[PDB]
Amino acid sequence: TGRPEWIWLALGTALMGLGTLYFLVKGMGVSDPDAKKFYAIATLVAAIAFTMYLSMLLGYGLTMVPFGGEQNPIYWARYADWLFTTPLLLLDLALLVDADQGTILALVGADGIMIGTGLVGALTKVYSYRFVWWAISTAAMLYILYVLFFGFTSKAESMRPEVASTFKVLRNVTVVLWSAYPVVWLIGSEGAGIVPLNIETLLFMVLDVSAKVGFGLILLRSRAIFG
Numbered sequence: 594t595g596r597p598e599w600i601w602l603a604l605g606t607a608l609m610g611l612g613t614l615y616f617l618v619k620g621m622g623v624s625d626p627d628a629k630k631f632y633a634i635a636t637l638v639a640a641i642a643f644t645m646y647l648s649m650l651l652g653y654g655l656t657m658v659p660f661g662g663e664q665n666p667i668y669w670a671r672y673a674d675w676l677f678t679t680p681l682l683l684l685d686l687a688l689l690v691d692a693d694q695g696t697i698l699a700l701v702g703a704d705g706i707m708i709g710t711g712l713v714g715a716l717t718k719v720y721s722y723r724f725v726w727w728a729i730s731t732a733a734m735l736y737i738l739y740v741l742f743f744g745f746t747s748k749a750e751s752m753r754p755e756v757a758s759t760f761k762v763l764r765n766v767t768v769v770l771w772s773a774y775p776v777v778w779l780i781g782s783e784g785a786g787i788v789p790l791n792i793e794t795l796l797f798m799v800l801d802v803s804a805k806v807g808f809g810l811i812l813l814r815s816r817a818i819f820g
């Protein structure tokens with residue numbers, strides 16, 4: 594098939610198979626348990642992205658959805674990816690500031706809504722409805738960013754300065770990265786079609802890798818992961 598965006602997928606596969614491995618060996622070296630599970634979580638988060646990017650590299654998780662008179666190419670392997678990785682990364686932040694069970698259930702439940710409506714909206718055939726789904730989804734995301742920015746950050750201050758200090762950085766990678774996502778969906782292949790597909794995969798690879806591997810390196814690298 595040799596699609597123009599395969600380059601960026603072959604590239605995604607490589608940066609995540611490589612991140613997954615670095616995490617995995619470093620993780621099996623640690624003896625602390627509190628810190629030990631920040632390592633399993635990251636080995637798993639990179640690993641899921643990895644089988645997905647590669648599988649896509651290989652022509653799976655791609656489907657043609659009709660709308661706007663075209664036969665639009667929708668990569669759904671992305672939502673299977675995000676479905677499991679986004680709630681776990683939120684789990685990374687919740688363990689860190691000692692979240693309640695209630696707040697974690699809520700962040701996860703809303704996260705399920707983000708991706709579920711994201712996917713539905715990306716498989717819709719009526720052009721204006723795609724955008725109703727994109728919108729309930731984004732609203733879910735703003736909600737999660739709200740909690741994190743207002744709730745978690747009130748609570749990262751019951752921690753040590755090294756923990757709040759670390760939470761502020763990861764919290765800042767999240768807010769910046771997670772919010773570009775709805776803007777890319779919408780100007781590219783799933784939304785307006787302004788940005789062609791090789792450039793979309795290229796921007797989703799950079800947010801993905803930044804957000805999983807850039808995130809893991811910063812987290813696993815801090816003193817705060819030792820309870």
Ligand SMILES: *C/C=C(C)/C=C/C=C(C)/C=C/C1=C(C)CCCC1(C)C
Nearest residue numbers: 711727730731734771774775778804
């Ligand atoms: C490793 C992947 C990460 C951190 C993915 C984050 C993904 C999002 C914040 C996705 C958001 C979306 C919307 C706000 C609306 C339209 C559809 C989505 C699912 C692309």
Ligand SMILES: CCCCCCCCCCCC
Nearest residue numbers: 702706710721722725726729
């Ligand atoms: C828990 C929230 C479930 C929300 C389902 C909303 C469906 C809205 C459909 C609007 C179609 C025009």
